Design a protein around this nucleic acid. Structure first.
Length: 91
DNA sequence: AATAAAAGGAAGTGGG
DNA sequence: TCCCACTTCCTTTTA
């Protein structure tokens, strides 16, 4: 199945959930979730994965934090903002 | 208090 | 066996 970072990058490219997620500086790979509309995006991630429970933004971001050590996605010190690595953006 | 973002340890599930 | 790539649950901290 698709990886979470790929699911998010694909959404940013397609623009299908523009009210839930957007680029801040696409050249840097920084992106931000909507405070009010992020749960709809989390729900879609869980359904795409076929998970047993409803996905929440909280559980999705728990998974996002695990990328910090390996580098695919890092938290930025701005509200609801993260950053893809150069490798993820190229690949 | 009410709300919310950010955090991570620990254990469970998937598909190798 | 035992890691992958999360998922789920619970509790804490800060604003």
């Amino acid at each position: 199945k698709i990886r979470l970072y790929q699911f998010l990058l694909d959404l940013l490219r397609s623009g299908d959930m523009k009210d839930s997620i957007w680029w801040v500086d696409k050249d840097k790979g920084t992106f931000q979730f909507s405070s009010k509309h992020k749960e709809a995006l989390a729900h879609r991630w869980g359904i795409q994965k076929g998970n047993r429970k409803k996905m929440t933004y909280e559980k999705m971001a728990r998974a996002l934090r695990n990328y910090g050590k390996t580098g695919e996605v890092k938290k930025v010190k701005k509200k609801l903002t993260y950053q893809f690595s150069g490798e993820v953006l190229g690949r």
